[PDB]
């Protein structure tokens, strides 16, 4: 039973993969957007909350 | 004594505290009805303060407070003083004594002189759906009858003093039999004593004033205590009025369900139609239960005893016969209207040399069309001196709008005439009221598909805007060229979402966008878009339609009875009045000969019953 | 008039394929769904025939 | 119902006028705004999930939840959904318009 | 949800809403009539009540 713990975990996947796509955009690597595509759909999967 | 002094004196109920204050009233010309020791908020006087704060049923201050107010002179002003508060408005001291269930002090306030037709027109004393708590009556006689007091409701009628008659309408027209319906929930503890005092105040009114039916008195909505139980959904007091036999010889005109002959186990019974069925001459209980019933137990009120056979009787007397006429005269009239569109030779500016009888067969086709266009108009005109009454009005106007453009030779005639032809066959879909299967799925899709498809519309719009904007951001900008299968364009907002759900349902072949930034993440997000969306969202809707078909199966019998009821009354209310009086269901029975003898011209109805237990 | 022809063709594809078919399937789903008791008794009546 | 131990109650009778009775419950620890522990937080969060949906709907715990929904629940939730939806549309634009 | 929003408020706003009312219950040992926050539920009884 994940009644509140599902979307709390799914908010944590979002809260990490915005920071990860931020930091990969910060220094050198063009692969920031590959993680950011996950941040889009998890940003819109979490509207089902 | 100040103002908070004396209110605190009578609150504890301790007597001999004022003990000769009656000179001090007469000293400064102080009187109890004066605003000095009256509470400024409500308007409460000494006598109400005693009654609310009663102790073990009796307050000995009250015969003192009656005697002190007797000497000062104010008794008519003192007994009868309304709470001028907007939260208790009109509440006299008589309403409090009948409330607190004490027969004793009611007898004193009547004897010293009450205002027994006192209209408690307060915001507290309103209906529950009108910002109020307890409705009753707005009269002291109705308080005894609504709050279950058989001894007080006897006393308020046969008092030596001022008599509260059972006829007086209140501020909104309700008599006490309107009030007993207004406080009757259809539970068991409620409709036990409600049916008792509906009897005990009807029988008492006939053993009183014997020329007035109290039930015939209408409130200020035109309704009667039977039609008020019809409109407000009640079944406990609704069954009782229809099956109300009274065996007393003086009160026999107050009887419905007359008993009749019985040859062994074929016991007959004879129900009345005084208000259940008129031919448009008066209001009807049957029209209320089918059209505007504050939508409550219509499946239980259209079943009681005689309403169930009165719709079966009208069906096989004129109802079924006129219904198949109403189908095939409408379905042939559409085929006539259909062929005037397919074989129409004008295409604008009509062919003035018609000169052919084949053209004259089609020329009579619009004459039938103009007849249907003006007759569907005139039926809707005589209504307005409503869902589907307006759709026939649409079909009526667009024929008339076309017929004006026909004679004017306007080329837009053929455009408007198809808008009638799409709409007319939608009303052929409406003529299913009686075919059980087709009438079942008519109001399925009203609530089951405006909701579920909308409920499916949220989860798809939440997903698709997420995925597509993620995946068009995955694509490359035009840096090398304005082609969508390589780059992103202005129509990338459109052509992706077109290609998005197409690839899911039937375009399972390749359809792959090569020029992407990372093809390894595009194919993974596409795989999630297959399963975390529409495939799973289909299995939701199968489980939705799997479970919400069990709800309409529960209402299977209960929607067909109301379709079949709206079928008969629409046929019946379209007839002229002499034709309806030709079809009076039941028979004119002479059943009683009460005073001013002139025997009962009462249109009754036979219901036979086969019973071996009673036998 | 393609302005009104595309309107009425949409009402065709909505009412026939979506509406009237789902009117019929949901009708089948509850009317002849519970014939487990009925068709058992009719076959025994047919087998005796 | 007696006098000396009346304070050990939690359903007080308030007023009555025929069949429209009014009783007055207590919120000693049924709802505390952060000064204590509270049952309505324990029922929703720190409860054994077998009878949790049957303990919410007894008496005021049922009505107190729809009352807070009536006061600030429906308001601040509807503000929350449109603020998160207007947060992801901004994050949508930072995806497609990413040079 | 309702308890989640209510935690997100500060105490100052949360005391300002305070579902219920501050009634005077009945006289106690220390003078005051047992001042308690309370909630009112109205109910009909046409029965033996
Ligand atoms: C012993 C039993 C026999 C009694 C006599 C028979 C009754 C005569 C009278 C008769 O048949 O009248 C019917 C009436 C009730 C309606 O249905 C009319 C059509 C509408 C829309 O107005 C639907 C209704 O059910 C409805 O709800 C209203 C408001 C009226 C009826 C329609 C006419 C007034 C033309 C009509 O005629 C039909 O044929 C029905 C369908 C409409 C087709 C038009 C026909 C005209 C030219 C073909
Ligand atoms: C009349 C009423 C008076 C109102 C006074 C002030 C009301 C504030 C009260 C408010 O709206 O607070 C919100 C709450 C409910 C949450 O959304 C918080 C975020 C998370 C993260 O797990 C959890 C939730 O999303 C969740 O699941 C529920 C039910 C609570 C929200 C988040 C805060 C507590 C900071 C929050 O604030 C936001 O702005 C985030 C919103 C979520 C994203 C949207 C964009 C952020 C900024 C708007």
């Amino acid at each position: 039973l994940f009644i509140d713990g599902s979307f709390q975990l799914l908010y944590f996947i979002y809260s990490v993969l915005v920071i990860v796509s931020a930091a990969l955009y910060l220094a050198g690597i063009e692969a920031y957007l590959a993680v950011m595509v996950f941040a889009l759909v998890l940003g819109w999967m979490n509207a089902l909350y | 004594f100040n103002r908070p002094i004396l209110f605190d004196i009578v609150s504890r109920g301790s007597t001999a505290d004022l003990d000769g204050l009656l000179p001090f009233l007469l000293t400064h010309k102080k009187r109890l009805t004066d605003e000095e020791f009256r509470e400024p908020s409500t308007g409460k006087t000494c006598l109400p303060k005693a009654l609310l704060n009663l102790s073990n049923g009796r307050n000995d201050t009250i015969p003192v407070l009656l005697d002190i107010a007797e000497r000062t002179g104010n008794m008519r002003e003192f007994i009868n003083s309304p709470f001028r508060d907007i939260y208790y408005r009109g509440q006299t001291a008589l309403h409090i004594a009948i409330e607190r269930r004490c027969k004793h002090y009611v007898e004193l306030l009547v004897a010293q002189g009450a205002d027994v037709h006192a209209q408690a027109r307060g915001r507290f004393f309103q209906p529950k759906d009108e910002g109020g708590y307890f409705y009753f009556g707005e009269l002291p006689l109705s308080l005894a009858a609504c709050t279950n007091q058989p001894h007080i409701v006897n006393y308020l009628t046969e008092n030596p003093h001022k008599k509260a008659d059972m006829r007086r309408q209140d501020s909104r027209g309700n008599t006490v039999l309107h009030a007993l319906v207004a406080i009757a929930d259809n539970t068991r503890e409620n409709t036990k004593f409600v049916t008792k005092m509906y009897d005990l105040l009807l029988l008492k009114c006939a053993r009183l004033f014997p020329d007035s039916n109290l039930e015939a008195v209408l409130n200020n909505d035109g309704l009667s205590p039977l039609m008020m139980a019809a409109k407000t959904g009640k079944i406990g007091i609704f069954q009782h009025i229809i099956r109300r036999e009274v065996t007393d010889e003086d009160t026999r005109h107050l009887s419905r369900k007359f008993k009749d002959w019985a040859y062994g186990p074929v016991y007959s019974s004879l129900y009345d139609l005084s208000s259940l069925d008129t031919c448009g001459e008066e209001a009807s209980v049957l029209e209320i239960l089918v059209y505007n019933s504050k939508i409550e137990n219509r499946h239980e009120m259209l079943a009681v005893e005689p309403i169930n056979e009165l719709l079966r009787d009208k069906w096989r007397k004129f109802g079924a016969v006129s219904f198949y006429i109403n189908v095939v005269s409408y379905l042939c009239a559409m085929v006539i209207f259909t062929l005037t569109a397919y074989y129409q030779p004008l295409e604008g500016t009509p062919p003035y040399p018609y000169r052919t009888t084949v053209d004259y067969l089609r020329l009579a086709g619009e004459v039938i069309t103009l007849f249907t266009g003006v007759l569907f108009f005139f039926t809707n005109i005589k209504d307005l001196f409503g869902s589907f009454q307006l759709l026939y009005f649409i079909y009526s106007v667009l024929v008339i709008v076309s017929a004006a453009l026909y004679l004017a030779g306007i080329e837009a005639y053929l455009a408007v005439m198809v808008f009638a032809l799409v709409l007319g066959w939608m009303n052929a879909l409406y003529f299913t009221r009686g075919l059980k299967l087709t009438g079942t799925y008519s109001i399925m899709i009203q609530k089951i598909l405006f909701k579920d498809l909308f409920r499916f519309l949220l989860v798809y719009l939440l997903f698709m805007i997420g995925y597509a904007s993620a995946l068009v951001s995955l694509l490359n900008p035009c840096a090398n060229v304005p082609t969508y299968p390589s780059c992103r364009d202005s129509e990338t907002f459109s052509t992706f979402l077109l290609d998005l759900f197409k690839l899911t349902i039937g375009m399972g072949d390749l359809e792959m966008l090569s020029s992407t930034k990372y093809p390894v993440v595009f194919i993974i997000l596409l795989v999630t878009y297959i399963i975390l969306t529409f495939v799973l969202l289909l299995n939701m809707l199968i489980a939705l339609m799997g479970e919400t078909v069990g709800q309409v199966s529960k209402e299977s019998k209960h929607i067909w009875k109301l379709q079949w009821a709206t079928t008969i009354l629409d046929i019946e209310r379209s007839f002229p009045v002499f034709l309806r009086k030709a079809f009076r269901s039941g028979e004119m029975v002479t059943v009683g000969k009460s005073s001013d003898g002139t025997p009962d011209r009462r249109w009754c109805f036979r219901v036979d019953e086969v019973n071996w237990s009673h036998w």
Side-chain angles (χ1 to χ4, degrees), chain B residues 99-100 124-125 133 469 473 488-489 493:
Chain B
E99 168 66 39
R100 300 293 180 184
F124 182 77
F125 309 101
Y133 290 93
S469 66
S473 64
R488 62 179 68 185
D489 294 330
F493 294 102

Side-chain angles (χ1 to χ4, degrees), chain B residues 89-286:
Chain B
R89 183 180 291 274
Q91 182 177 3
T92 66
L94 178 59
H95 293 176
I96 303 169
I98 306 167
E99 168 66 39
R100 300 293 180 184
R101 299 185 62 85
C102 182
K103 183 173 170 63
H104 298 88
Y105 291 96
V106 180
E107 295 180 352
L108 279 51
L109 271 67
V110 170
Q112 277 71 243
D115 195 1
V116 300
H117 301 285
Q119 292 184 357
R121 300 177 294 175
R123 190 177 293 113
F124 182 77
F125 309 101
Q126 293 300 108
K128 182 67 172 64
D129 54 354
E130 209 265 331
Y133 290 93
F134 185 65
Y135 168 67
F136 73 102
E138 295 181 356
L139 205 150
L141 173 60
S142 300
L143 204 162
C146 292
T147 65
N148 197 3
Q149 293 175 0
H151 298 285
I152 292 96
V153 72
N154 288 317
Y155 180 75
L156 289 175
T157 59
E158 49 99 23
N159 52 358
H161 295 85
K162 180 68 180 295
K163 296 177 73 68
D165 55 353
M166 290 175 279
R167 298 181 296 169
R168 185 181 295 270
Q169 302 181 358
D170 62 353
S171 176
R172 66 181 69 251
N174 293 330
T175 62
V176 63
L177 299 185
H178 289 277
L180 284 170
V181 176
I183 59 99
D185 280 332
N186 47 2
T187 68
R188 185 182 62 84
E189 291 88 4
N190 205 168
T191 61
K192 185 182 285 185
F193 73 98
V194 169
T195 62
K196 296 296 287 184
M197 289 183 185
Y198 188 83
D199 289 332
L200 190 146
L201 274 73
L202 189 66
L203 274 307
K204 188 180 262 78
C205 187
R207 292 179 180 178
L208 268 73
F209 295 157
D211 54 351
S212 178
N213 202 165
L214 204 281
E215 182 176 355
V217 174
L218 304 178
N219 55 359
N220 292 321
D221 197 3
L223 275 74
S224 66
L226 179 60
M227 294 188 286
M228 188 175 176
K231 183 180 258 78
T232 52
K234 281 87 175 64
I235 64 169
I237 200 64
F238 179 74
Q239 292 177 356
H240 180 76
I241 294 169
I242 295 170
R243 293 190 296 270
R244 190 181 69 244
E245 68 271 14
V246 183
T247 60
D248 293 332
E249 67 271 13
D250 53 354
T251 63
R252 189 175 174 86
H253 59 90
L254 293 177
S255 179
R256 298 175 69 172
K257 185 179 166 63
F258 295 105
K259 185 63 186 293
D260 205 2
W261 57 264
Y263 191 78
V266 65
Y267 296 99
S268 178
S269 293
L270 189 61
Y271 289 91
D272 190 0
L273 291 327
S274 294
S275 180
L276 291 173
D277 177 70
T278 181
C279 297
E281 294 177 353
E282 197 259 323
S284 177
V285 182
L286 184 60

Side-chain angles (χ1 to χ4, degrees), chain B residues 447-510:
Chain B
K447 76 279 189 186
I448 205 168
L449 193 145
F450 285 170
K451 181 177 89 275
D452 294 336
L453 189 283
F454 181 75
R455 182 169 61 187
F456 185 79
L457 190 145
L458 269 308
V459 69
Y460 183 75
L461 186 143
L462 286 174
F463 285 162
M464 182 182 71
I465 298 173
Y467 285 96
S469 66
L471 267 61
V472 301
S473 64
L474 196 276
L475 302 182
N476 51 354
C478 289
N480 196 3
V481 180
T483 60
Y484 176 69
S486 179
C487 182
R488 62 179 68 185
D489 294 330
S490 178
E491 203 178 3
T492 307
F493 294 102
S494 176
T495 58
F496 189 78
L497 65 54
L498 268 306
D499 193 75
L500 190 61
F501 66 95
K502 279 174 93 286
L503 192 152
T504 62
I505 50 172
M507 282 63 250
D509 54 355
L510 183 65

Side-chain angles (χ1 to χ4, degrees), chain A:
Chain A
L1 179 144
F2 291 102
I3 282 175
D4 55 352
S6 180
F7 288 103
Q8 192 68 38
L9 187 282
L10 271 297
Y11 282 158
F12 185 75
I13 302 298
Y14 180 77
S15 68
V16 169
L17 273 72
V18 172
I19 300 298
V20 174
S21 294
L24 268 296
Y25 181 74
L26 282 175
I29 299 171
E30 73 272 15
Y32 65 96
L33 192 144
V35 183
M36 189 179 286
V37 173
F38 293 105
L40 265 301
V41 289
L42 270 303
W44 287 95
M45 283 182 183
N46 287 320
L48 196 34
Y49 178 77

Side-chain angles (χ1 to χ4, degrees), chain B residues 318 321-322 325-326 329-330 333 368 371-372 375-376 379-380 383 392 431 570 574-575 583:
Chain B
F318 64 96
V321 177
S322 177
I325 294 298
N326 287 316
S329 178
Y330 182 74
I368 299 169
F371 181 73
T372 59
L375 185 55
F376 285 162
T379 53
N380 293 319
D383 288 331
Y392 288 104
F431 281 164
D570 283 332
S574 65
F575 286 169
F583 290 161

